[PDB]
Amino acid sequence: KTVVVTTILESPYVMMKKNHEMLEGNERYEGYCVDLAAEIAKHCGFKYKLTIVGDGKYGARDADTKIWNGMVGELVYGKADIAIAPLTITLVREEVIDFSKPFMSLGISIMIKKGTPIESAEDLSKQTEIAYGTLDSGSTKEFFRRSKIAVFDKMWTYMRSAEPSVFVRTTAEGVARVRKSKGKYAYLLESTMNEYIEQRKPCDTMKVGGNLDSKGYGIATPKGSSLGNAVNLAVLKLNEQGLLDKLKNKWWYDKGEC
Amino acid sequence: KTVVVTTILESPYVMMKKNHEMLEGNERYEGYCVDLAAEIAKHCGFKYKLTIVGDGKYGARDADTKIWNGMVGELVYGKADIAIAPLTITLVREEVIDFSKPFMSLGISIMIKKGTPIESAEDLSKQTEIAYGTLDSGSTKEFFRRSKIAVFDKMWTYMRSAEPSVFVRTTAEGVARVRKSKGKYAYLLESTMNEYIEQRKPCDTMKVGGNLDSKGYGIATPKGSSLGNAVNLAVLKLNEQGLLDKLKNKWWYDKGEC
Numbered sequence A, B: 001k002t003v004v005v006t007t008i009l010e011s012p013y014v015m016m017k018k019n020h021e022m023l024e025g026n027e028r029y030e031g032y033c034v035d036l037a038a039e040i041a042k043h044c045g046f047k048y049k050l051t052i053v054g055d056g057k058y059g060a061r062d063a064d065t066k067i068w069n070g071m072v073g074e075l076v077y078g079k080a081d082i083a084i085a086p087l088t089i090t091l092v093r094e095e096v097i098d099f100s101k102p103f104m105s106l107g108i109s110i111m112i113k114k115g116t117p118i119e120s121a122e123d124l125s126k127q128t129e130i131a132y133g134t135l136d137s138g139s140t141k142e143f144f145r146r147s148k149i150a151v152f153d154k155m156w157t158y159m160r161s162a163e164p165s166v167f168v169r170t171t172a173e174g175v176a177r178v179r180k181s182k183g184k185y186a187y188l189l190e191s192t193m194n195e196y197i198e199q200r201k202p203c204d205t206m207k208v209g210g211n212l213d214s215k216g217y218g219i220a221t222p223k224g225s226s227l228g229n230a231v232n233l234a235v236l237k238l239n240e241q242g243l244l245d246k247l248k249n250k251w252w253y254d255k256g257e258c
């Protein structure tokens, strides 16, 4: 009965509340997806338990074992009933799990330490002094791996064989790398996160250029789940009521530090 | 075996080709949705016939008769197998027809004749000199009718009883009204159309302020339709290959013009 929700510790979607060490269950967390989960459960009429994904990954199919990891894996193998996180709707994923219509729109973007002489993806691909990478096991990495667009294919061929590795395990690692590399590392991540980080101290990073593509985040459920329909309608209702815009303003700018 | 596609004459989505009088079938038309339709059909493996919606409407449920009109109506009552056009994904529509994930992201926006002293929805609501309205039988009108955001509800309250009516039968009517009203009429329509018009002669209109909401267009099919799955996957694949961005750049090609 209690719906098992798989999510990921990614600010400001899901974060440990200040006094979390002495809190239990859902009360240990806070964030945009924590609020969204509450709204969805309310509209769909179910109780739930937020559970952080074991491997801390979004979801990718291992070319080798052919096994799915991350939150996608938790759904595919029946460990969770639903995923409420900034999970990107993609073709390979839609083939194994279901997604509600988007609750947020975004696109891949470039994050630089302020002052870095880079304005676009093309700029990056035409130089080698500044390294650049992306997150492991995510849609952004897969985007570059599959891209047939000249500039992106060129960037991928570079990234895939760069040393030391330009790929990071978590968004926090990528942000730290941009911040500590004196402008010698640029990070590729989704726009809304780029935007969120530009609002965090020490306010030394920024988004450059336009988005490389246009996609959306969706609430995912196992293929053919009984929750699919109700969740989808709930997301549409919440968006039309303006709750999603409200949630965005709350966690991004009302709590901004720059 | 031929799929009946319902669509609407709306530039640059679907337009009559030059010399269309001597052409027949699908060859009579050109535009973003015409090209999209060709791509979708190619990926899903089906032949199709483009048909222009009889009442020239997007789709709304008649308050009193309880009857869906426009392209939504054509799907609901079995007149068409699929709708390929700038049809907004909404809750009320999703309750009676199915939508693929969005193939385009956009939002409601404001169109003013250049020079109009208006910069936002709030500016519009705080005055009465400049009349403002929207398209009938569409998602934008329903947005205001149902919005509880003070500003939008305030706008709805004024629009509902203004004289002469601020609502128009077609987009062309609303645009023409902005252009002929010497700045005394502002029009509410979706962003990508506003931007399309802003780049064409006589170059006397412009989009002002940010978008009022965020949403997308989706390819629609009757509820439970067998075509649903394939069309959805096709849209995701086309977006991931960059075809959707290519079509946008093609039909919004900065035409020479302003």
Ligand SMILES: CC(C)(C)c1onc([O-])c1C[C@H]([NH3+])C(=O)[O-]
Binding pocket: A010, A058, A059, A086, A087, A088, A089, A135, A137, A138, A139, A140, A141, A171, A188, A189, A190, A193
């Ligand atoms: C952390 C976040 C969300 C900003 C992100 O930035 N680049 C990515 O690949 C992802 C993960 C992506 N949303 C997914 O679902 O794989």
Ligand SMILES: CC(C)(C)c1onc([O-])c1C[C@H]([NH3+])C(=O)[O-]
Binding pocket: B010, B058, B059, B086, B087, B088, B135, B137, B138, B139, B140, B141, B171, B188, B189, B190, B193
């Ligand atoms: C004409 C177009 C497409 C610019 C538009 O702009 N405001 C609207 O309401 C619509 C129609 C809407 N997409 C729908 O499906 O009702």
